[PDB]
RNA sequence: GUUUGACCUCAAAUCAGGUAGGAGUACCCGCUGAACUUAAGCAUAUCAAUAAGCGGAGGAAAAGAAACCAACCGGGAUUGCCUUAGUAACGGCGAGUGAAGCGGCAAAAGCUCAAAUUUGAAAUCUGGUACCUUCGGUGCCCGAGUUGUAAUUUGGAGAGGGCA
RNA sequence: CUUUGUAAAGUGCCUUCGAAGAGUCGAGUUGUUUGGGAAUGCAGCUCUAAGUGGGUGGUAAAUUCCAUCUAAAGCUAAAUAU
RNA sequence: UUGACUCUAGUUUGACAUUGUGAAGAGACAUAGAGGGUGUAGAAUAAGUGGGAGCUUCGGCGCCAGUGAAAUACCACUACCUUUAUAGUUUCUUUACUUAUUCAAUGAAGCGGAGCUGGAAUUCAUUUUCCACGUUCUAGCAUUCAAGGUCCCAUUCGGGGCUG
């Protein structure tokens, strides 16, 4: 299998092969929108292995978000409040920028099924997504067994809600004592830990 | 590669033993050595360990014999080459200031008794204090025929000042592959006080008193 | 070159894989037989067919049982063949980069095929085989050892060529 | 320089069939985000990872079958309650904040891909057309697809080969 | 009424194997956040792995062991909210 | 409102990233090989660490007499100064290349190189290199390929090749 090989090469970014391909696509991606369709994977080995198969319904959708902090968009960057939120230009939007490029395509495309994005290249003002989606009204998706699970309508906007791989990590859901304050739920959890829960005989 | 060079190693050998042109063919065993090869070479204001590791393999550097000890040792080894030294004789040898400087110019090798490294330390000690020519402990009544490759085979690893040393590897009438396995030991019992090796390696030379031009690391 | 190639196509003309109409009537006959005499897996005689599909000559060339392969020069992310001379070199399987996946596509019976390989051959066409491998192996096997060191582009345009051309004329050819 | 045909990428159409918005929002998943207030003042803190603002679902949602807890004679997905505990910890160590494991109980159920040569046979799928027993079925025909669609394998395993 | 079927599943001993996810893990730094305290999570930017490997083991590091899982891909009712 | 305490949009400076490719000075590094050191006695000039009793076709010194810490000669190898001739990285500074990036403009018309005609360069009519490329007294006009040439239209109707 070839996409041992490919797998195995794609992680080297910095031999001569790979930093010479970075340079000529990054400029083609550049060129073409900052949305635009991709009429195959250009990692095919990196797409199958997030779910990516090649049969009619699956697309792959390029997508370049802006680099960079998240500045606050207040007004002369005044800000009316306290100092410790006087901050304006150092300040991290809280998603990744795999979401922001997750969700501009969910809503692009809104008739499919974002099933998982990945990083593709980057230069200094952009970074460079391939968004594997899936086509829900495609009989080709909604027969098979092995994706007829994204069809039912609990997986609209996964993206929007932050269900993707993205999402899962920007919401630290993951097992151990690492993810204490975020692994059911930050909202849930805090208000369970909020809640003053009474009994008929206290 | 998988016992280093002997494919080079083996044309170092058999192409120095056996030459009248090259090795010139002199009188004696043609006997065998190397210096190192490595980075490690800081001078060491940290005064370099300089420890007499062993092998009982034998490098033979055994021409010139003497004795110290006494009383058993004289009349016990007297069949041998040896050369009997009395107790009330060091006195008028170390009298004169030359006798000394011929005594450890040549004899280079020592036989010393339980008893007699006690008279030792005061005359002949710092007169050169770098020669690296000593006497091993042997006792009184004991095998003597054991000596012959058990003092000689302990060579010295004095390095002060300079990190130059070179631990002599065998000679002609010793074992052929027995010198190729103690040049690899003769590296690892040199890692032992040393932390790098530059790597698994030393820098390879068996000069059997004459080093033609074998130009390994 | 358009020869060799020329001569490569027209032995990979033959070994064509079994087309749709071929296969069902080839089916209709085991399946057949295995009724009218219960002789089945013996009936339909061995293959030999070209095999093609980047995963299975990968596979063939690392088993070694590949006698040529041909390397399309076109491939859409090049990584996916980028790696396929030096495992083909390593492995001792000869190999020739050829012009068109569109040319392999229509060998193959698919619009693109982005590699081809004869692991088999017919014992008529095996001299021809042997003759277009030793052809192939001079370009690219044998060579490969040389053209790993050396570079391609850094090839200017038309008229920097010129401009750089004048230039040069300009001081040493005053 | 022509003959015809491919391929790749990008288009067009009141092209065959389709799908997205908006509403609602009690509960749910996210983003963004204060100040009043408390501190007897106030700037960190606090209110609060709250109100407001925006994106997105369902009858529940989310989570979830370990890159977990532990240090035991070890437990064994997920969520909820009782408890741990107003504790360990945080903090102008001020005001104030503040979990988790074990334990009893409620309900319980597990699994799927990628990375393998089907290679003695793309075995796979959409579509169109005809007929039927019509949440579909079958024959034929174009297409998708080898830049990998099926069968097999999911770590507890498991695959190839051997014998019973 | 059939009838799948000549085709699928579990089970034992031997022999070779036994693939297991990368701008990720991780590190520095900035901001935020947490009870998480030489840094609990999250995010931006720079660097950027490995294959007896990687994470974790609630005081930073070096050397030595040990224990425990198997990340960077995914599906999944009920007990809960209203 | 301000040299009050604490911050901040902005702006500016540095580092890193976007950030590639060459040439003239330099670190050589794998890669060499000639010098490259006299405190001491001593033939005399021992940086050293490990060798030794005889070699060399003849010469020459060790062996041993010998001085001194270092026994020479016969050579290996380790660095401590030097030479450069490998083209194995920017290491730092002086220029250059387009292709990333950047700023324009056009309804993307004439760009670049060469060739004609130059009229000529005189070294002399050239395979030598310097030397332009249809519009000017005037408030007019300039648009549908005309002239020659070649095949078809059976020589009707004209439409077509290349020049122009």
Redesign the pocket.
Known sequence: ?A??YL?EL??K??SDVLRFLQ?VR??EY??KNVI??????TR???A????Y????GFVIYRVRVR????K?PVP??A????????????????????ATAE?RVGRRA??LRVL?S??VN???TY?YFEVILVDP????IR??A?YN?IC??????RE?????????????????????????????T??????L?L?RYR | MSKITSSQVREHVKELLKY??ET??????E?V?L?V?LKN?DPQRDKRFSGSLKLPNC?????SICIFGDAFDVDRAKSCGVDAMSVDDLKKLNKN??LI??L???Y?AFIASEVLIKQVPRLLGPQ?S???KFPTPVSHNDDLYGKVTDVRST??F?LKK???????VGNVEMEEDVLVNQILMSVNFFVSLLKKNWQNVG?L?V?S???????L? | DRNTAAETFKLFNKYR??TAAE?KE?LTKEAAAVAEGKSK???????Y?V??????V???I??K?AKLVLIAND???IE?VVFLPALCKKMGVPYAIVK???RL??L?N??????AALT?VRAEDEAALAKLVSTIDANFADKYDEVKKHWGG?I?????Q??MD?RAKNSDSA
């Open positions: 299998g996409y041992k797998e794609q992680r970014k910095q340079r990054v400029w550049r060129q635009h369709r991709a009429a195959r994977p095919p080995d990196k199958r292995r997030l779910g198969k090649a049969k009619q680099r960079g902090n998240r606050r002369k960057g800000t009316y409040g306290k100092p410790t939120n006087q901050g304006v230009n150092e300040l991290k939007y809280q998603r990744s920028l795999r969700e809104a008739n998982n990945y990083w980057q230069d200094s970074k009204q495609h009989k080709a027969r098979d092995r699970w039912d309508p609990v997986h609209k906007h929007a809600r932050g269900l993707t791989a993205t999402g899962k990590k920007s919401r630290g859901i993951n097992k151990g004592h690492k993810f204490n304050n975020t692994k059911a739920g930050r909202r849930k805090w208000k369970r830990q909020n809640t829960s009994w | 009248s042109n010139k063919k002199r009188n004696f065993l006997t050595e210096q090869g070479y490098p033979r550097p055994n021409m200031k030359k400087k011929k450890s110019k040549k280079n050169l770098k020669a690296g060579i010295k004095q300079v990190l130059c040393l070179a631990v002599a820098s030379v000069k008193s004459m080093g033609p031009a074998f130009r690391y | 894989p079994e296969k080839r897996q013996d009936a339909s005689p061995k293959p067919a095999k093609y599909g980047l995963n299975h990968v596979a063939l690392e088993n049982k491939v859409d992310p996916l068109g996946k569109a596509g229509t193959v698919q619009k693109t095929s982005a590699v088999e850094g200017l345009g038309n008229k920097a010129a401009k004048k």
